[PDB]
Structure formats: C-alpha cells, structure tokens
Symmetry: C3
Subunit: 275 residues, 3 copies
C-alpha cells in the first residue's frame, strides 16, 4: 500500500520465535517471518503456530510473512494467518510465476503482496506480475535465480545475468507504479565491506533497499543508503546555480539541464531539505 | 528515408540565437535547436521567434529542432514552425512514449521524426516507436533515463542500467531498419579523454554518433569515430585472404569466416 | 530428446573430408560437419558428396551437420542427407528466424535441430524458436551477430551487447525445457588463456559447452568446464551440513539456504559424487 522506501527487510525463520523480537529491535524497516524455505517441511505446522503465538502475544508488532507458494498444502493456512492478524502487514510470495498467483494471494489474505522473483518463469511474466492488483513492491531472490539458471553465484558472469533480472525489476517497478524495490540478499554475513559495496551498487541502480538475513547487516545498509557529504554538496551547488532560473548551466565542469537539476533537487529533498 | 551516418548532433538553445551560427560552423553533422528542456518556460515563446528569424534570415541552413512534447501548450506552435520552414529537416520528439505520438508529430510537421528515448515507458514501447512511419533514427536521453529510473548518473550501476536501454535502441534500430542511432550526451565538456572513451564505447556497440552539447566536442567525436590505422590494415589483410574466395582462413591468429570477411569489407567501404 | 550436456561441438568443413576423422579423434563431444558458410558456393555440391562417403564409409560415426537454410537451392539436398544416414544425429539450422523454419527442417530431416541465432530477427523471435517442435538446444553465432548488429568484435562494448543475446539463449533454454546451450565460437585458435577465460565465463553463466573450430580447443574446453577441487570441496562441506541438520546454516562465512544447498548438491551429482 506504501510508496515510501523500505531500506531493509530482515528474514527470521518462524522456527526461532525468540529471535523475532531481536529482529524487530535491530531497527530494520521491515521484519520478514519466514514459513517457507528457511522452515523444514516437518516444522512448518509448528512454525505457523509459533508465528500465531507471537502475533497474539505482541499485538503492536508489524511484520511481513514469507508464505509457502500455492503448490504447498499449507498455502491456504499461511494466507489465513496473514488475513486474521493485524500484525501481518504484507506477505512475500516466493516462486511467483504469474499474475494469477499474485491475485489469489492478495485476495485470500487481503494484504499487500511483495512478489519475489526467483525463476526464469517469474522473469518472463514480470510485466503481468508487477501489474497485478495487490502488489506493493518487487524484490529479488538472487540465490534462487542462480539455482534456476545454473549460475556460479559470485562470479562476474552470474552477476551479469542477475543484472538482467535487476533491470527487469527496476523497469517494471516504474511501469506499474510500485514502491521502490529491494535488491537481493547479501549472504557473507560478516563481510561488511562487501555488504557496503552491494548496497551502494543497488542504490545507484534505483533500488530502495535490500533484503537482509542478520541483524548486523542493518546498520551498514542504512548508513550506505544515505547520500554522502559529497553527493549532498554537489546537489546544493546544482540547486544554487539553478535558483536564478536558467535553463542550462555548468557545475563541476558538467552541463546541467532540467533532468540533472531535477535529480539534484530530489536528492536534497529525500535527505530532508526541500525548498 | 535518410540512412546516412550522423556522427554528431550538437544542441544549442533557441534562447542564444547568436550561438546557432557558431553551432553550424563547428562542423557537426547536425545542429539541434532546442525549444524544450534547455529553454526556461518563460522564454519559450521568445525562443521560438528567435528560431523563426534564424531560419528566415539563413535559408541555406539545415537544422534539427527539439520541440516541446504534446503535453505542453506550445506543442502545436512548435509543430507549425517545423512544418513551415524548409531549413527544419527533422524534429526531436522528447519523452517519446507511443507510436501515436510519433505518428502525430510526423503527419503534423511533414518532416522526419527523431524519437528521444528518455523513460522506462519509452523503452517498454520502443518496438512500436521504432516501427512507426516517419522515424529516421533513435537517440538516447541518458540523463532523462537517469531521472526517470532514479539512477546515480556516472556510477557503475547506472551505466549497467543504461547499457540495457542502449541495447533496446540498438536492437530496434536493426529490427525496424532505421538509420544509425546516436548515443547520449556526454556532459563533462572539457574532459576530452572521457568524451573520447564514451564515443569509442558507443561506436564499438553499433551507434553511429553522439548527441553533443558544446562545439568543442565535435572534433573529438569525429576523430574517435574514424577507423584507426590498425582496424583499416586488419580489414585490408582480411580482404586479401578472402579475395581468392576461399571458405575459411586465419588472420592474426583468429579464424576468419564469412561474417568476419563481411565485417571487414563493410569497414573498408565505409572508409571509402 | 537428448538433455545431456555437450561440452564441445567442433566445426569442420565438408570441403576437407580428410579432417573429419581428425575432428572425431579429438575427443569433442560433437563434431559439426559444415555445408553452409564455411563452404564456397561452388564447392557445396562436391562437399555434400564428400560428407556422403564419409558417413557411408564410417557407419559408426555420429555427427551434426550445419545445413544451408531454406532459400539456398541445396536446402532439400542437405535435408535428405541428414534424413538418410544414421550417422547424422542432428542438424544446426543457421540464420534461424522463426519457429516454422525449425519445424520444417525438423520434419524434413526427422532429426533434432540446433537453432543457431545469428541475427537480430532471430533474437527477437527466440521465444517462438526455442519452443518449436524438434529443438534440442540453442547456440548462437557470435561473429554473425557482430555483423548483423555492427559490433566491433572483441571489444568490451561488443561483449556487453553479446551478453544480451547470451542471456536470451539462457532464459529461453529454461523456459522451453531444452538441453544445455552452447556459447559461441572463440576464434583466437592458439590463445589458450583467452579460450580458458571465455569457457569459465560461459560455464559460470549456465552454458553447457562451447562451439569450437579447431581440435586443439577441445582439451582446454573440457578441462575448464570440470568443477575445480575448490568447488567440489565447498559443495562437499555444504552438503555435509545439510544432512547434519535442517534449515539455514553458514559455510565459509556465507548463509546457506535451500537454493544454495540445491546448487551444491547438483554440482556433486553432475561430477559423479554425492554428499
Ligand atoms: C543465518 C543465521 C541462521 C545465522 O544464525 P546463527 O549462526 O545462530 O547466528 P549468529 O551466531 O551469527 O548470531 C546469533 C545472534 O544474533 C541473533 N540473530 C541471528 N540471526 C538472526 C535473525 N535472522 N533474526 C534475528 N536474530 C538473529 C541471535 O538471536 C543471536 O543473538 P543472541 O546472542 O542474543 O542469542 C541467521 O542469521 C538466520 O536465521 N537468518 C537467515 C534468514 C533466513 O531465513 N534466510 C532465508 C531467506 S534468504
Ligand atoms: C555551451 C554551454 C557549455 C553553456 O555555455 P557556456 O558556458 O557559456 O560555453 P563556454 O563558455 O564554455 O564557450 C563559449 C564559446 O563557445 C560558443 N558556444 C558554446 N556553446 C555552444 C553551443 N551549444 N552551441 C553553439 N555554440 C556554442 C559560445 O558562443 C562561445 O563562443 P564565443 O566566445 O565565440 O562567443 C552548454 O551548457 C550549452 O549551452 N549546451 C547546449 C545544450 C542544449 O541546448 N540542451 C541540452 C540538451 S542535453
Ligand atoms: C580455421 C581452420 C581453417 C584452420 O586450419 P589450418 O590453418 O589448416 O590449421 P592448422 O594448420 O593449425 O591445423 C593443424 C592440425 O589440425 C587439423 N585441423 C585444423 N582444423 C581442423 C578442424 N576443424 N577439424 C579437424 N582437424 C582440423 C589440421 O588438419 C592439422 O592436422 P594435420 O597436421 O594432421 O594435418 C580450421 O580449423 C577450420 O576449418 N575450422 C573452422 C571451423 C569452421 O568450419 N568455421 C565456421 C564455423 S564458425
């Protein structure tokens, strides 16, 4: 339902309900309680009840739930849990491959849907998936895509293929008028330098945030998404020269036209200093 | 209709009519007189009149005009100016988002249309846009695309996104049988090394030229687009070994088959 | 229909029939005898007859044939040769731009078709081409695409454009359920280091092998495609932890979730191991 930015969406599996408050206290903009791929078949019924217990016992909590996809016998049970607790403000639909799967999850839960693209089928149908009623924003399942397309995760070639999927997510986001999408999970938990590089790369591309998997990732993500002093000072220089009214001028040796001035004004506004 | 290469298309705003002769004298293959985003709203009526007088006073001049798009109240006056002066040999259509917008601009002006792809919407509809009657060639609005898709212009990530959009311009160019497209503006006016590299990259990719924004960029663009001595000597060597007519051979340690021989002959003929 | 991996498909022109045995003795997974663009128009009739003796004289030989496409007058004669010799196990269809071209080459020969994408039209129609009856797998003509799209072969910009065609082959391979595709020819015959790099790049991206053009290319292709000791030992460590428990865990500092465990298990199975 939002058009605002989500910087961080932190997974926590419903098998570890004691970790859900820790996820919420981490400062992440969103917490995702997982009922799907982090939870083994045998623990999924218990985990669903764990999540029900947490939501009842923590009525002020607001969380996303990654539900089992329609193939699973627990699909309707996941959707009903989303529907029946005000603490569930949206669901992640994994393995999404059709507008129909989005519509069914949205109507059944009555809550916003985050489609997670993790397969070639999802990419091929992303136009209709993004355009489906109930979609809040799109996110990426990088490791799922590497499995589906047989990519060597982390190599230059895999990242080039994933660049094609990221582009599609960013294109359809603007085509369907969705809220800012989230780039995929960065799995090297303690590699802050690599996490920082994944975040800046994602932000530079128009992603609003990242799915994440450990509370320690939250602080690097939020600091990296902030405009640097240099980006702020550039935009101030561009906005100053543009205040008189001129159509085209020069700043730092570069021509500045309407699109450049607009980017500079939006950068300043998004950091808390509009006109 | 015109399917020649345009190496350089130099913008000049109609607010600076004394600069229009300067732009034509730069040697650019095309001059674009701008009535759109380089011209403040308050100056657009005066600027259109500046352009009218330039065209009337300079009848041998042939120029492109960037008009305001249909949403702007001055759209019809821009189209009329394009229609009524023989010196206007084509128009740039900004923020192009549908075949219908091209068809209307072409019918109204009776002149070739240069769609400028500057948005995700334009990209989504580029198949129909490129195929529309009246299209001469496509050009890339990199800075507009960066605004529309919220890209950090100049970063590695932004250029990767821009690479995907350039591909669509290059693909649809070939599919619709258009003239060679133009890559986007390089804004760092005095950075010749950076400008030289953007041009080589664009050419290597199948672009025929660049939109440009300062007369000083024209000579660097034109020289960088020239085939180097090394490329020409390679093409001549490939042209020898292929003159006998033999099926497949080797040059410089590389297999040469029919497409390589074809590529070499086209390089030599485009160089005279 | 074959869904095994072909690591190497070695071209040899039917004008050099003495070289066809050398091509097979090289160990390539497939030999492609060319009747099309490597053979001068004036030699195509004799070349077809050269290929005819070779199959007659060598009945245990199994080869692919690159035929002349539909408007060349020898098309039907090429198809009859493919149809009538058990040694022809498939054909490469050059200049493919439609599903109908695939269907007609498939039914006429009764043999599996490898569509070879060499033009922008072929790319734009690749959804239909790959889904066509008779398709075994895809490959492309990288040099042909460079001609058709006016690319400076070998430059970074050209490889960026070819990256879009590689993505398309890989996307449609998975959508149509085809066998692993082959990346394009690497033409610098003796540059093993460069050939090794193109192979690593192709495999990391999900290609099963490469078209090649000289016997000396085969051993480098085959050696580069096998998983490294490091990849195997990593996959062994990941699989061990995935039996020891259930759910998400960490290996080498990285989170391992269901797709990562799946990828590690797939690598071990393809190399003949397990766990
Ligand atoms: C990867 C993971 C299993 C690591 O768990 P671990 O090895 O036990 O964690 P560490 O020892 O590194 O850190 C544990 C500490 O952080 C907390 N923690 C770790 N991961 C957490 C998470 N995702 N949410 C909340 N708290 C978490 C633990 O409660 C503990 O705090 P404590 O010391 O007060 O008990 C864990 O981060 C996790 O479950 N996240 C993955 C999210 C997921 O479901 N992934 C699938 C979608 S891609
Ligand atoms: C030219 C520009 C750098 C601003 O002007 P500027 O800062 O005064 O230019 P400079 O001082 O560096 O150079 C000035 C000299 O080059 C001339 N000239 C400069 N830019 C010119 C241009 N686009 N077209 C024609 N002539 C130009 C000037 O007349 C002057 O020559 P002079 O001394 O003989 O009078 C640039 O911002 C511009 O106007 N670009 C045109 C782009 C446009 O119209 N739209 C942008 C679409 S992306
Ligand atoms: C490119 C090509 C002409 C080079 O031939 P060349 O210059 O004679 O190559 P070399 O001198 O290095 O040959 C060395 C040895 O390999 C053999 N050889 C070379 N290319 C061969 C091939 N494609 N198949 C089988 N044997 C081959 C030669 O016969 C020679 O063995 P020999 O000493 O026993 O006679 C040759 O590799 C070829 O025809 N292949 C290209 C594939 C093709 O059809 N092209 C179009 C597809 S993109």
């Amino acid at each position: 339902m939002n058009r605002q930015i989500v910087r961080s969406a932190l997974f926590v599996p419903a098998t570890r309900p004691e970790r859900i408050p820790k996820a919420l206290a981490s400062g992440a903009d969103r917490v995702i309680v997982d009922l799907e791929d982090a939870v083994e078949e045998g623990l999924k019924v218990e985990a669903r009840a764990n999540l029900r217990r947490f939501l009842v016992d923590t009525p002020e909590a607001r969380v996303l739930v990654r539900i089992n996809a329609a193939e699973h016998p627990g699909h309707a049970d996941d959707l009903a849990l989303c529907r029946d607790h005000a603490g569930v403000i949206g669901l992640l639909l994994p393995k999404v491959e059709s507008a129909a799967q989005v519509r069914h999850a949205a109507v059944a839960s009555g809550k916003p849907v985050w489609p997670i693209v993790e397969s070639a089928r999802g990419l091929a149908a992303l136009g209709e998936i993004a355009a489906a009623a109930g979609v809040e924003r799109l996110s990426f399942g990088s490791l799922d895509l590497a499995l589906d397309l047989d990519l060597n995760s982390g190599s230059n070639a895999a990242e080039q293929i994933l660049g094609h999927a990221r582009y599609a997510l960013l294109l359809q986001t603007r085509l369907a008028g969705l809220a800012p999408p989230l780039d995929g999970v960065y799995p090297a938990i303690q590699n802050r330098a690599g996490l920082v590089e994944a975040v800046r790369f994602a932000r530079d591309m128009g992603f609003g945030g990242l799915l994440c998997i450990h509370p320690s990732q939250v602080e690097p993500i939020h600091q990296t998404l902030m405009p640097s002093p240099a980006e702020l000072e550039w935009a101030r220089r561009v906005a100053e020269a543009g205040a008189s009214g001129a159509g085209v001028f020069v700043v730092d040796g570069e021509m500045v036209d309407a699109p450049v001035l607009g980017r500079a004004r939006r950068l300043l506004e998004r950091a808390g200093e509009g006109g």
